[PDB]
Amino acid sequence: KALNFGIISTESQQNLKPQWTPFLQDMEKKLGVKVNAFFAPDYAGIIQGMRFNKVDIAWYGNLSAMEAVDRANGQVFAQTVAADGSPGYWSVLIVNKDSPINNLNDLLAKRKDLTFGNGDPNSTSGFLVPGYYVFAKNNISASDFKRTVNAGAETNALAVANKQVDVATNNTENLDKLKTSAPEKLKELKVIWKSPLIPGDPIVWRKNLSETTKDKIYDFFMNYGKTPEEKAVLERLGWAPFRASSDLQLVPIRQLALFKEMQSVKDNKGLNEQDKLAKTTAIQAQLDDLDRLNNALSAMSS
Amino acid sequence: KALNFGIISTESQQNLKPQWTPFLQDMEKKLGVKVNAFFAPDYAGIIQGMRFNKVDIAWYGNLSAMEAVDRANGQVFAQTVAADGSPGYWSVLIVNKDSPINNLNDLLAKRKDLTFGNGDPNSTSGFLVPGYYVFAKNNISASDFKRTVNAGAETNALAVANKQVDVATNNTENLDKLKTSAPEKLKELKVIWKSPLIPGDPIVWRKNLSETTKDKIYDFFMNYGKTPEEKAVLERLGWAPFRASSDLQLVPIRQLALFKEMQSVKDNKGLNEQDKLAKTTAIQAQLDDLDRLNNALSAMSS
């Protein structure tokens, strides 16, 4: 009963090897079952490895992560945690502290009268994530602000801080940097809207594993880190210890997937509107259900 | 597009009528769609009403609630909240405050050396709920205490308080009463283990409703109560305003269902062990998956 982990490698074939064997070697111990890897070229070959039992487990990104559930027996069981201390990031919208805005509701209104900072239109956290939760969800637009401007978080946070822009989007990881980059202009910022947590990469195994096997993996992963040795070894892969997870993980990413896809049907050229109505109104279905989940989940305050 | 609510009535045909029309009459307004009820004799006829679109929505109990999802297009969308202030209850285990125990781990060990207070063996919160989360889950027993005694929460809490028993089970709703019944012997108690939240009755509609319809119900329910009028009307049905919910609701009840069922196969007389192994080890599968969910859910601390 040997074991395969999945790790692609942008950190190529030099970089990766000596960061990992350790984590295998403890894995092999506690599990006491030989623990090879699949290095990779991309998640595409990796999911496929799952799809054929040739790989048992793996460090996906929610996107890859989600298609694993989709096509190759995925079950998220754990969320990676940043060695600085977790855990993913929340998208945001930010006014200056001297602003008399505090709600997204405030903002939502005083909008035709204000100037916006929007992220890379190829950025999920600066552009797309807010694009759904903020805009799409309220049937309103980046249009509808006096003037609107696209730029980087760092800029945009600084933009707002220095009252060159009314409101901007951002993430909380940039918000972090600042406490070092410009602590005294982050002190001037004010967050008025948080996305869902957009969380860290998961660990997915294949469901078709065995009661007993999973039990060991699961506990390995849930308990690795409590030791100074253990602790310091996660770090070499930039990690803190792992959060307990589920497929519920990727609800934010699922919504995105299907907001995009929704967006691409409204533009589907050679589709008649009868047959649109159907699909559009079906993807919404899904979002609407997914919305209510987010609520439920956030309503376990608590 | 008229509307049917489900409400059984132990509070029979006199009691119920004038507690509800109000809540219909607001329902009919905001929805602006006529809102009859099904009174009932039992959830059995009620789920069936769903199963035939003859009823659209209803106040189930997690048990009924769960079989609704099972057999008649259930989706939990809201959790009832006690007019005193919510929300279900957590089972517990309780030592005296002068005890040097604080963990379930402590207890788990010092057990052969101690005396237990166990609830009605026909009580879910005093007996069965702990029976799983505490015992079943750690493959250990009510056996394994010096002596063990079964009795009511009130007794048992008082038992422990007055150091007639080492540890006992309880719920937090009794724990409430006490602050009135015996505030100064509840002051002597100490909780060392909480179950999952075992939550309040839900509102389930049938999935096969319509985007738009659900949207209105959903918002009606999520927003009813903010007004003094609204507020005071929920009260006449002993309610505070409603929590946002999902089928995730009944994970605790699902685990129970299948702990029982697990328990009843181990006792299934005319079943050979080969064919047992299979089922036992399949129900465990489920619990084990459900366990990991509880974790995930409780690991969104947060």
Side-chain angles (χ1 to χ4, degrees):
Chain A
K1 255 169 230 209
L3 271 170
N4 308 276
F5 206 78
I7 323 70
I8 80 93
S9 78
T10 248
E11 309 285 346
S12 296
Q13 325 316 332
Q14 258 233 306
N15 294 316
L16 284 176
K17 262 268 174 290
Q19 302 160 31
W20 274 94
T21 353
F23 187 65
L24 314 189
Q25 300 313 317
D26 299 67
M27 194 148 28
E28 292 164 68
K29 278 163 168 162
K30 286 78 184 305
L31 286 348
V33 0
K34 283 60 199 163
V35 178
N36 291 272
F38 270 40
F39 284 28
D42 44 358
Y43 294 128
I46 276 305
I47 105 161
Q48 282 312 301
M50 273 211 163
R51 196 159 141 73
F52 305 116
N53 308 299
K54 282 223 157 165
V55 78
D56 308 5
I57 191 166
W59 160 27
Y60 292 110
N62 296 308
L63 231 202
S64 350
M66 172 174 66
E67 276 169 61
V69 193
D70 286 5
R71 318 153 162 284
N73 296 336
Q75 224 190 306
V76 192
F77 66 96
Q79 203 214 307
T80 62
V81 147
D84 75 33
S86 95
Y89 64 86
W90 299 262
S91 276
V92 282
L93 285 179
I94 39 151
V95 315
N96 207 275
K97 256 155 49 166
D98 300 21
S99 178
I101 311 251
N102 336 251
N103 271 202
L104 183 50
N105 262 116
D106 298 21
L107 185 292
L108 258 185
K110 282 65 149 101
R111 78 148 178 277
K112 283 169 194 316
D113 218 313
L114 275 199
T115 65
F116 185 50
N118 203 53
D120 184 337
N122 289 80
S123 161
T124 34
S125 70
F127 171 101
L128 226 134
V129 177
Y132 177 57
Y133 296 103
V134 227
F135 298 117
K137 233 168 79 193
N138 301 301
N139 206 326
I140 49 143
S141 336
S143 295
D144 301 319
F145 291 77
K146 216 161 110 191
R147 151 194 67 195
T148 187
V149 275
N150 288 61
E154 207 212 32
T155 290
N156 279 2
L158 280 178
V160 166
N162 284 302
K163 316 177 195 199
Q164 308 133 9
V165 85
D166 288 288
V167 50
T169 56
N170 250 242
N171 64 80
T172 60
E173 214 197 308
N174 264 67
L175 281 255
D176 207 328
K177 285 173 210 256
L178 286 224
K179 288 218 201 318
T180 343
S181 165
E184 268 267 277
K185 303 305 192 247
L186 166 44
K187 193 171 200 141
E188 285 208 60
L189 283 196
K190 145 159 78 171
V191 168
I192 70 166
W193 173 87
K194 280 193 160 213
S195 72
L197 168 24
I198 290 144
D201 300 318
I203 327 320
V204 189
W205 57 38
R206 37 178 184 100
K207 280 149 58 52
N208 70 31
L209 297 167
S210 43
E211 191 264 347
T212 113
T213 280
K214 296 195 211 158
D215 275 284
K216 309 195 74 138
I217 290 140
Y218 188 86
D219 282 305
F220 168 58
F221 285 84
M222 236 45 141
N223 299 284
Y224 198 73
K226 286 155 191 180
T227 308
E229 268 259 353
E230 294 177 340
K231 265 130 166 103
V233 151
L234 276 157
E235 309 286 282
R236 290 187 87 73
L237 328 341
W239 280 323
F242 312 88
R243 205 128 264 268
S245 214
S246 80
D247 304 49
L248 294 197
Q249 172 124 358
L250 326 77
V251 171
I253 259 284
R254 210 160 246 308
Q255 290 174 311
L256 267 26
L258 46 89
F259 169 45
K260 273 195 192 279
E261 227 263 337
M262 163 82 56
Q263 210 76 157
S264 125
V265 170
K266 295 186 159 206
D267 296 273
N268 181 351
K269 329 274 47 142
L271 243 191
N272 64 307
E273 197 77 30
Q274 199 313 308
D275 301 37
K276 273 192 256 276
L277 156 72
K279 261 93 263 205
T280 351
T281 64
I283 298 126
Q284 189 56 27
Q286 279 156 87
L287 297 162
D288 283 356
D289 259 355
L290 275 167
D291 294 309
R292 285 181 271 276
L293 189 68
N294 279 344
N295 300 155
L297 284 158
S298 301
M300 334 197 313
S301 16
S302 229
Chain B
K1 255 169 230 209
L3 271 170
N4 308 276
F5 206 78
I7 323 70
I8 80 93
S9 78
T10 248
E11 309 285 346
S12 296
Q13 325 316 332
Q14 258 233 306
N15 294 316
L16 284 176
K17 262 268 174 290
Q19 302 160 31
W20 274 94
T21 353
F23 187 65
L24 314 189
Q25 300 313 317
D26 299 67
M27 194 148 28
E28 292 164 68
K29 278 163 168 162
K30 286 78 184 305
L31 286 348
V33 0
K34 283 60 199 163
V35 178
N36 291 272
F38 270 40
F39 284 28
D42 44 358
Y43 294 128
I46 276 305
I47 105 161
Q48 282 312 301
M50 273 211 163
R51 196 159 141 73
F52 305 116
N53 308 299
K54 282 223 157 165
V55 78
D56 308 5
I57 191 166
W59 160 27
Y60 292 110
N62 296 308
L63 231 202
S64 350
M66 172 174 66
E67 276 169 61
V69 193
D70 286 5
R71 318 153 162 284
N73 296 336
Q75 224 190 306
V76 192
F77 66 96
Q79 203 214 307
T80 62
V81 147
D84 75 33
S86 95
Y89 64 86
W90 299 262
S91 276
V92 282
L93 285 179
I94 39 151
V95 315
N96 207 275
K97 256 155 49 166
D98 300 21
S99 178
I101 311 251
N102 336 251
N103 271 202
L104 183 50
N105 262 116
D106 298 21
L107 185 292
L108 258 185
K110 282 65 149 101
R111 78 148 178 277
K112 283 169 194 316
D113 218 313
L114 275 199
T115 65
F116 185 50
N118 203 53
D120 184 337
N122 289 80
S123 161
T124 34
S125 70
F127 171 101
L128 226 134
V129 177
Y132 177 57
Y133 296 103
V134 227
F135 298 117
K137 233 168 79 193
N138 301 301
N139 206 326
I140 49 143
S141 336
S143 295
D144 301 319
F145 291 77
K146 216 161 110 191
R147 151 194 67 195
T148 187
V149 275
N150 288 61
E154 207 212 32
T155 290
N156 279 2
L158 280 178
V160 166
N162 284 302
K163 316 177 195 199
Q164 308 133 9
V165 85
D166 288 288
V167 50
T169 56
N170 250 242
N171 64 80
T172 60
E173 214 197 308
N174 264 67
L175 281 255
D176 207 328
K177 285 173 210 256
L178 286 224
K179 288 218 201 318
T180 343
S181 165
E184 268 267 277
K185 303 305 192 247
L186 166 44
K187 193 171 200 141
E188 285 208 60
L189 283 196
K190 145 159 78 171
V191 168
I192 70 166
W193 173 87
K194 280 193 160 213
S195 72
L197 168 24
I198 290 144
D201 300 318
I203 327 320
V204 189
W205 57 38
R206 37 178 184 100
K207 280 149 58 52
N208 70 31
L209 297 167
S210 43
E211 191 264 347
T212 113
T213 280
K214 296 195 211 158
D215 275 284
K216 309 195 74 138
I217 290 140
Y218 188 86
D219 282 305
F220 168 58
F221 285 84
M222 236 45 141
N223 299 284
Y224 198 73
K226 286 155 191 180
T227 308
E229 268 259 353
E230 294 177 340
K231 265 130 166 103
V233 151
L234 276 157
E235 309 286 282
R236 290 187 87 73
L237 328 341
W239 280 323
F242 312 88
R243 205 128 264 268
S245 214
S246 80
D247 304 49
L248 294 197
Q249 172 124 358
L250 326 77
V251 171
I253 259 284
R254 210 160 246 308
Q255 290 174 311
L256 267 26
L258 46 89
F259 169 45
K260 273 195 192 279
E261 227 263 337
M262 163 82 56
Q263 210 76 157
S264 125
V265 170
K266 295 186 159 206
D267 296 273
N268 181 351
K269 329 274 47 142
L271 243 191
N272 64 307
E273 197 77 30
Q274 199 313 308
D275 301 37
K276 273 192 256 276
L277 156 72
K279 261 93 263 205
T280 351
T281 64
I283 298 126
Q284 189 56 27
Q286 279 156 87
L287 297 162
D288 283 356
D289 259 355
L290 275 167
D291 294 309
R292 285 181 271 276
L293 189 68
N294 279 344
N295 300 155
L297 284 158
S298 301
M300 334 197 313
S301 16
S302 229

